[PDB]
Amino acid sequence: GQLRHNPLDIQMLSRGLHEQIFGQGGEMPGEAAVRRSVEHLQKHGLWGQPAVPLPDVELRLPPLYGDNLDQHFRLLAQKQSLPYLEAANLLLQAQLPPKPPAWAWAEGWTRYGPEGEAVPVAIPEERALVFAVAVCLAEGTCPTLAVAISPSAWYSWCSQRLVEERYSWTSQLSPADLIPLEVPTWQEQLVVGHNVSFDRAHIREQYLIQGSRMRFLDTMSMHMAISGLSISSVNSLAEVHRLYVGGPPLEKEPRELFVKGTMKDIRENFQDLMQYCAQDVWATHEVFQQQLPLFLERCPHPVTLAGMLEMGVSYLPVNQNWERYLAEAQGTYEELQREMKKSLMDLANDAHPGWYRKLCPRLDDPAWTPGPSLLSLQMRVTPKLMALTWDGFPLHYSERHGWGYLVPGRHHGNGPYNDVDIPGCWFFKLPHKDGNSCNVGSPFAKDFLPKMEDGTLQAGSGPRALEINKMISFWRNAHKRISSQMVVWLPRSALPRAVIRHPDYDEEGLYGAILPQVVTAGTITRRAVEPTWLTASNARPDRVGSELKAMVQAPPGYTLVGADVDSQELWIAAVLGDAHFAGMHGCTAFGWMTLQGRKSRGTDLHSKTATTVGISREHAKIFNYGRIYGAGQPFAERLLMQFNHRLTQQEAAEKAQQMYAATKGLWKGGTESEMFNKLESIATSDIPRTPVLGCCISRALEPSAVQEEFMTSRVNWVVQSSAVDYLHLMLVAMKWLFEEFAIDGRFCISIHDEVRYLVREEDRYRAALALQITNLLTRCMFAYKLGLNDLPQSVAFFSAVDIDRCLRKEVTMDCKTPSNPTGMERRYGIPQGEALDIYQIIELTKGSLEK
Incomplete structure (x- = not known):
């Protein structure tokens, strides 16, 4: 039947899934490898244990391009980031006219000719540009000045609040108070800048809900990917220019008028600030044209570029309930x-x-x-x-x-x-x-x-x-930037037609948005960094303002759909070890334990580890992930002491030694020795590359310049970058799934292993099914790259997928906070959501993503 087993009695994928994914035919495992795996399983005494079959899953995946999995993902990423690469090369290989003599003093955009003449224009009309903005902190969050560069000629932008002077200005930001850097319908645009999230935040059309059709390229992300730090430099643009292009150092302007000054100071010092901004734009142009070839050579798999471009469109919608939230949170903050x-x-x-x-x-x-x-x-x-x-x-x-x-x-x-x-x-x-x-x-x-x-x-x-204190701990450390998140409220005309026609649409309500300042690659392992939204609790019953995620509320006609990956890094290490040892699933017995772990039954890897140690499930997750990255006994003893304090240091060392005796081994003789051997083999290879995508490590940690040092970080890079490749594959696959079947949704935010989307009310289970298919496809490609021609059924899909009108880990919690003691339903009229499993999602969507 559709059930299938390996020579180590573990159920694999269904026949349809395996036939559609890995094709037909392959190299049968050798008898010696099978005997060795059976001996290893009997050594730990975990062989022959019967397992209740999980129900089989049969689904028709979307067509996969090319003739192979790696070919499919390469084609997807090239298709996604080809136009932006073309714009990148256009900006890279181009001339640059000198700075204009005198800057214009007029409202709106102005184009400067070759001779310094100033011609007013509405918006720049360039495929690729470099951008810079000016902000006076004594007037508000509205931008002040902008100078742009291009292969053709320069551009300048002056804010209406700098030209005209008024006693008072509107306290609510509007699309009328931003920078017009968009061109409605070559197609698609590229914007390049250092920490380009800030310049994205000050664009008038970046707060729309229809669609962007524009990506932002950050020299911070590429600098972190190539020469990041935990032939290298810090993320500061002056250091980046000095390292990559060189020449005179970039002036610092110790006046710092924008940080500390008034509007009149800017009114008098127009030329100096414009000169500084133009200098920064030219410097960024030189840095980008010096950095692009290194990035293209060092990370030849296009998936890195496609995912980095796609991971810079974060968007958070806040409706009129946010306005009440600030007062109610602060009122409770004041009253408490x-x-x-x-x-x-x-x-x-x-x-x-x-x-x-x-x-x-x-x-x-x-x-x-x-x-x-x-x-x-x-x-x-x-x-x-x-x-x-x-x-x-x-x-x-x-x-x-x-x-x-x-x-x-x-x-x-x-x-x-x-x-x-x-x-x-x-x-x-x-x-x-x-x-x-x-x-x-x-x-x-x-x-x-x-x-x-x-x-x-x-x-x-x-x-x-x-x-x-536990109540107001969250709002204490984040209220300054939570209250100063820039909010842009659309007019009735700019809202989508679907929102207006919805029954819950309120004519007297307020619709707004927040654009997170996300660096797409802010770590040496290509991890995104956001100081607030990527590190924040979902919802808790005893924290003031903990409804911050629960305050990210879709407008009527939309909802938040997301999911969490189950044992992502765990399964990555499992497939690595299995491919290293014998070419079958479950040989190293780490994959065996992970495959036979069950969450509903209560006997899984995390649960077993927590029971053996004597800690919680989250503590077990943290311990397992820290071990997979590679950690010594002292780190494990410190973690155990953190998760339990009566334990003494002399006993902590003994407990850590006992834990490491079963695992690791001598690496041989351990439960998870083969994955360690595979990691050491690939990491120590010449020009280290990811086992899947073959994207090299940063130049600050290559073995040539480090020799036999920092081995722990080098090994941890393998696992973390494999997970980041998993995330980039997830992003590109989800974008492709949205585009192919014409799904009306938008990338909201991704938190490490948690990916969330802002989708319409009409299509939510479709987003859930697409996310499930993305996880399955990513795991199949991950397995195939290492040389394994099969995938387990038990780790094929997501455990649970959440559909909700707010951001929270569970769709059931009522978010009763000291500031919201009544609940989402009682305060903001927000009901409870739904959580679904693969069988339920298939039943709801009938296995199709069409209409």
Whole structure:
């Protein structure tokens, strides 16, 4: 039947899927390899265990171009990024007229001729350009000046708020207050700039919901990919120009009028600022024309370029509920903060002293109020006035070590540190997200949220003050940029016709948007970086303003559809090891355990690891992923101590050694030895390349210039860049699926292994099915590149796909927050969503993405 098994009794894909994907015929595994795999399985005593078959999946995938999987993905990526490559080469191989003598002083765009003449124009008409914007921080977030370059001639742009002077300006941003850098219908455009996200944020037409038909190329992303750092330089454009092109250093203008100045200063210093911006644009042009050939040579697989271009169209819609959110979050932020100030007053009274004197405003202060009205949770004196204990151990701060805790009885832990001499108590350190070599500047951080749910961090209105800190921890560290996200509100004419015709459409409502400032490749492993939205909780019942993701609410007629990949890095390592060892699935027994792990049944890799260690499922995920990247025993013991503190260091070393005894091996004799051997083989090869796409590592870590150093980072690059190739394949495949079947959706945001989309209400299960097919195709190509001619059924598709009107991990949580105690339905009329599995998605969509 459709069920099929390997000589190691693991169910593979269905016959239809395997025939359509890997074709027919192949090299049968050798008898010696089969015997070796069986012996390895019997060595760990995990052979012959029956497994209940998962139901078979039969679906007709979209046609795959070419005659092979790698050919298919190469063709897809070339088709996607050919026009932008052509525009890149056009900008690269072109002349450049000198700077015009005198800049124009008029509203709108102006074109400068070869002789310096100024001709007013509406919008630039160039395929490829370099862009720069000017922003005065004393007037608002509206852009001020813009100078553009092209193979033909320069361009300049002056803001209406710099030409005309008015007493007051509108407080709400509008499309009328931005930069017109779009040309409605060669086709498609390329914009090149250093951190081009900022220049994308100030474009009038970049906030539309219909479509972009434009991508942005960032010298930061290419610089990170080629010569990034964790023949190299930092991401600063001056350093980039010095490293790649060289010549005179770029002036710095110590005046810094835009950061610190007024509108009149700019009114008088027009020429200097225009000269500086034009210099920066020319420098970026030189840098790009020097960088493009290196990128094309070093990453010959077009998938990297296509994914990098596609990963710079992030878009966040916020409707009128966001406007209420800011007040309700701040109103709760104000009300709770004043509530907290009264709690410490009672605590202080039960506890004038010098510390209490500093908490009281001066008598002559006009804003004087009775008692401690200057208190806030951001102050460093709040924890001391509470006598907090770290699992029954009082806290203690050190200048040389940051925050820590004292264990009476002078126990082994994160320490002990002898620089602090507390009689009868040892001194340890509070855990930090960046390891024990960094210091905690404030206990009011996100990292200590797990430490309070398990009772590790306890108060002495004692628990209220720490709980409310947990409430306003999210809004404390992000309100400045969350409140200063630029919002552009479309008029009725600019909104899509589908939105107007929808029954939930509100005539008196407000529709807006946010453009995240995403660097498509902001890490040496080609990882995207965003300080706020890529690292943020989905929704929690005890955090103020934690509905930030839940505040990214689609307008009537649209919804947010997304999913999370199941054991992405785990399965990558599994297929690597299986391909290295014997050319069959489940040989290394790591693939065997992953394949037979079940989430509904409760016996999976993460669950088994958590049970063996004694930690949570998320802790197990973190531990497994850290091990796959390659980590020593000390890192594992530090992670275990972070996830459990009663454990002592002398016992932490023993537990880490016991954990590493089963895995790793001598590499031979371990559960996950063969994947390690494959990683060491490919990483140590001449000109290291990804096992799948063959995209080289950064020049700052190649073995020629590093020799036998930084091996851990080099190995970690293999896994992380394989995952990033998985992500780029996901992006290009999802874009191709949207374009081929004409699906009305848009890329909203991608968070590591989580990819989210802003889709219409009419087509949501179609986006779910396309995401499932993308995961299947990516895994099949990943397996084929390593030499394996089959794919398991159990890791073929997604576990669950979420359809919702808000961003949250589960479609069921009511997002009851201190600022939203009633719920999404009661406050903003937002119901609960749906989560679906592959069988349910197929049943709903009938296995088709058509209409």
